[PDB]
Nucleic acid binder design. Structure first.
Ligand SMILES: [Zn+2]
Ligand SMILES: [Zn+2]
Ligand SMILES: [Zn+2]
Lengths: 233, 78, 95, 96, 103, 102, 78, 104, 96
DNA sequence: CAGGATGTATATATCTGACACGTGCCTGGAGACTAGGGAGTAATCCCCTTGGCGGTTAAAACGCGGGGGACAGCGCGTACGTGCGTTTAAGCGGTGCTAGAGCTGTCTACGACCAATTGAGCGGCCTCGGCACCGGGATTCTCCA
DNA sequence: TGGAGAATCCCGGTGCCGAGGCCGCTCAATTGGTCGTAGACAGCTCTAGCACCGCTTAAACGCACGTACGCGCTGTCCCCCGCGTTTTAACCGCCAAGGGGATTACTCCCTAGTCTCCAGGCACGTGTCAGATATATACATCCTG
């Protein structure tokens, strides 16, 4: 759609940070060695993608990514994209109530790679230390997502363009776990038809430790006024 | 030659009726002829191997029975 | 009389048929099937007794090997009655 | 103008051919099939009549068992007709 | 005759000869052919008795292959003993699947 | 602050991951000691105070696991034939019927 | 009762090696029944071999030969 | 040695002894053990070659049961010969049905 | 004191492995599997040659009976190369 | 606000368990020679296979109308996959005890083996009745008004 | 639902060839001696199987949640079935060569058994290396004053 129709920067923009694109985590995994598959390529100059983005290649079908250079397809394997950044086109739109939205810049085909949420991955006592120092400092925006149940991610220190999102009770994108370089990572993907201009906002499914969240400004009959998670922690 | 078509459509239909089949797709006839060709090829191959070992020029009934015995589909009465 | 002697089990299957069924005959093809069946079961039991004797480093087929082969090849109630018949026959024969 | 429904004749034929006991393939075409298959192994082979009868018996029994299991697959797939993939499934389960 | 002494109809002598000349062991115990003949007599008697019964159930006094087939397939343990066996001219059991019967 | 739980894996993804992991490895999938107790219980009904060699229980566990794996392979093929992706008891009974074990 | 010792996750893993993707809840009872029948037949034949050999221990060779008798020959034990 | 005379590795003499004392026939021909040892050594060489290639392609130098299992189940002819045998601790071939994969 | 002299095909399978791939080893369990395989193939070929000698009322297993057994057991190119190897072996053996 | 003690991830010299190679020894394999019987080869016969022909007629081919079952979409609900947290036997090692496998020694009963004999059982031929086939009516099943 | 109609079943009548029995014969079955190695049995040794126990922790378990897949319904359409009509070739009986299976005659070389001898193969130490483990070590955490 075109609901979130002067784009902003990253560091009318949000608070400043450092743009990252690599692995700059806390300490670290996934321990799942993806071996070199025998996928037929149909690739010499890019006539078709080798481990195709929507065909039947065994690596991509299970949210597993080939490392660059060791799979039999070589470098034309489209299931290498976390290591080669085949991201979509979003930008930072300023909204007075929704805050900062990832507006789509080109009309996006459904069920494709949109972006990646990268930041700092940390454990639970340092994670609650980050929580305590941030809500004693007085930030009103909280990025305390969980990669796995043990570890946690945060992007306000050293993150990327995936910060400018929110909760919508009707999601357009979603986030799913993938594995790359024996490292568990996160990726935001579309499911429905996406037109250039509207912010790509999904289900957070937060279990907030506080009592007063900002209201869900989705304005839909599916919105209960607040977000809605799993537990009342 | 093309004598494998001698096993005709209604004869395969008869075998199927004896097998309990009620309706038969048109492709079943060619599939059954191919399966039977494979089966008979194997059995006649074993029979001819027994016959050539016995220094005989005629495949006897015993060669066919022993050949079927080798494949766990023993036949009584020959 | 200018023909090679080809043995069979015909007369013995016929004797058993007359002992179990008073007024009943049997066709040539049915007798052929029964004869091949008896030769088949004989080959199975003798082969099983042979391999059983070989496994246990024995060189003789005794009543024990035949008994174990019969219990191995015949399922359930058949095996029970067959081992009963075998023991009965050996008991009568040694006396 | 009195016609049977598409399927009752099938059941009457099923009862008929399961009741009788005779070879269902035509003798001479099957003998030509046997001799043709035998040509590719040794030239000018002779066949005893009993060997051809034994081959026809084994051929009919194998096809009957294959079609019975193919029928069980067909009934399993909520159908009443048999398809080539049912025969391929049956032979796959058997082990070829 | 050793057959009458053992109370068997099958020839213990013939069985013993087939055992010696059949390349099964170097030595064949004396009780082995008697035991084997007894087991063969039992299996033959069971199949013949069931075929005879089926023949009377088809108003025939002469056993034909179809009756042997019915005899074999209606005994579960014989069916298990003869699961890889095909009886020539035997046919098939009258088994029609429920789903094909008219409703 | 708050913990932000994201979306889990879709049903079947972890299943396929297990498919690839267990088809690539060779370790035994049945617990050894419960299976050994099962073997001794089944053997109880033939001879009292039966003893087993460890290699015998191991050969039984290998044979058992290979037989069940092959049966589930055949069941999966018949299941996928019937336009489903979920095996049912009828599928295993059909597999055993066609194999000739019933 | 010990047939329930072959637990439901283990049965799932067995299906996983076989390529099964989704498993109905009713499968587990059928699988334990199949396992009981198979083990009953193989163990029965093994015990028959032990009773013949006048030994009290089921040996590996007895299990291999018992399996071979049922057309499921096993390599790697002798 | 009788093995060296035929250029074989497998023991012709042991095969001859097993044939005579294995209760297969009253008499055993002179050429039978040589021929049988040749067939056994050829089949052993074929399966060990396929296993070796499978192990080397999986970057291992020791042949393991898994590589034997792959050697057997990947060669159609040996698969046909060995369709009803179970190789201990061998597992199965990686085979995922196409239908199990996700859709478009 | 040593326990018991038990024979196996271990060293011959190892010599064949060293003849085809000198820098490759083999696990003990894999050597056991290979020994069971050799004993199996042996038992099958000897059993079939025995049945061939019996069916033709002969009491001698010669190289011809083994050859026919090989042609029955191996499916196709395996049989062709096995017969080639056996012919080579028997020829070189009897002609030296 | 401050270092010291402590916890944690990292690279590491080492420890273990399985595999390659050298050592003594023994039993089975190899070589040599002889006897006897299985089989190899020539020769003959005669059964039954191959080939042909002709008439019958039943089954196969072929065409066509039509119906019902296959197939695809839709919709719906529930059960099974995934995941988290709780618990429990599995596994491992460590220890102890004795049943029984495995080997040996000695002896004997039991079967191989051989010659003579004789009757059981097999081939040939011969006979009559169960059955295969046919015709006529009777029941039984199916389907459309 | 019942009458029409087709199919099948039953019931007697005729013909026929195959089951069932007898006759002559021959070789295999039985009996009695004669012997030689297989195995039954007692005893002894030593491995390994079972039983117990503590400890650690990985997998099983139970519940919660949610989605996607199974399953039922409905429409469409098309393909196979029922059946009639035409055709072709299987089938049955009969005949004619003649090929080759089966047997015979007789020879002869190949293999079992025996005897003599020694080295190849097996059990066992001894050395060496992928893979797992306790250990120095750098950087962040708490920890009390
Ligand atoms: Zn790929
Ligand atoms: Zn790839
Ligand atoms: Zn909302």
């Amino acid at each position: 759609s075109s609901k979130l129709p002067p784009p902003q920067l990253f560091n009318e923009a949000c608070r400043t940070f450092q743009v990252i694109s690599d692995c700059l985590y806390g300490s670290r995994s996934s321990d799942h060695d993806a071996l070199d598959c025998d996928c037929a390529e149909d690739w010499r100059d890019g006539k078709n993608h080798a481990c195709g983005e929507d065909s039947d290649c065994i690596n991509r079908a299970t949210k597993i990514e080939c490392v660059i250079g060791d799979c039999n397809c070589g470098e034309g394997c489209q299931n290498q994209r976390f290591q080669r950044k085949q991201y979509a086109k979003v930008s930072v739109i300023k909204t007075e109530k929704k805050g900062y939205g990832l507006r789509a810049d080109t009309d996006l085909q459904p069920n494709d790679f949109i972006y990646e949420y990268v930041g700092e991955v940390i454990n639970e006592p340092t994670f609650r230390s980050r929580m305590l120092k941030y809500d004693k400092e007085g930030i009103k925006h909280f990025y305390f997502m969980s990669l796995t149940k043990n570890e946690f991610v945060d992007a306000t220190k050293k993150g990327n363009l995936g910060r400018f999102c929110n909760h919508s009770c009707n999601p357009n994108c979603y986030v799913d776990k993938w594995v790359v370089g024996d490292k568990l990572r996160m990726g935001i993907f579309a499911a429905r038809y996406i037109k250039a201009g509207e912010e790509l906002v999904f289900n957070y499914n937060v279990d907030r430790y506080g009592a007063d969240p900002q209201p869900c400004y989705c304005g839909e009959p599916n919105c209960v006024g607040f977000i809605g998670g799993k537990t009342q922690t | 030659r093309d004598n494998i078509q001698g096993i005709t459509k209604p004869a395969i239909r008869r075998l199927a009726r004896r097998g309990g089949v009620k309706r038969i797709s048109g492709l079943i006839y060619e599939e059954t002829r191919g399966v039977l060709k494979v089966f008979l090829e194997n059995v006649i191959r074993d029979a001819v191997t027994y016959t050539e070992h016995a220094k005989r020029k005629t495949v006897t009934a015993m060669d066919v029975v022993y050949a079927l015995k080798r494949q766990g589909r023993t036949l009584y009465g020959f | 009389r200018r023909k090679t002697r080809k043995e069979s089990y015909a007369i013995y299957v016929y004797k058993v048929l007359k002992q179990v069924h008073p007024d009943t005959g049997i066709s040539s093809k049915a007798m052929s099937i029964m004869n091949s069946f008896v030769n088949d079961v004989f080959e199975r039991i003798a082969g099983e007794a042979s391999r059983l004797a070989h496994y246990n480093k024995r060189s003789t087929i005794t009543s024990r090997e035949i008994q174990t082969a019969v219990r191995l090849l015949l399922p359930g109630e058949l095996a029970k009655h067959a081992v009963s018949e075998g023991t009965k026959a050996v008991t009568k024969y040694t006396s | 103008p009195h016609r049977y429904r598409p399927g009752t004749v099938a059941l009457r034929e099923i009862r008929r051919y399961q009741k009788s006991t005779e070879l269902l393939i035509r003798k001479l075409p099957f003998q030509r099939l046997v001799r043709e298959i035998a040509q590719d192994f040794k030239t000018d082979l002779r066949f005893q009549s009993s060997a051809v009868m034994a081959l026809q018996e084994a051929s009919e029994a194998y096809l009957v068992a294959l079609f019975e299991d193919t029928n069980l697959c067909a009934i399993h797939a909520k159908r009443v007709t048999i398809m080539p993939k049912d025969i391929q499934l049956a032979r796959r389960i058997r082990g070829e | 005759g050793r057959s009458s002494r053992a109370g068997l109809q099958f020839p213990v002598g013939r069985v013993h000869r087939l055992l010696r000349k059949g390349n099964y062991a170097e030595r064949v115990g004396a009780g082995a052919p008697v035991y084997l003949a007894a087991v063969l007599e039992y299996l033959t008697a069971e199949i013949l008795e069931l075929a005879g019964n089926a023949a009377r159930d088809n108003k025939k006094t002469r056993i034909i292959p179809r009756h042997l087939q019915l005899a074999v397939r209606n005994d579960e343990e014989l069916n298990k003993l003869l699961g890889r066996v095909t009886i020539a001219q035997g046919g098939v059991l009258p088994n029609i699947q429920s789903v094909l019967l008219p409703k």
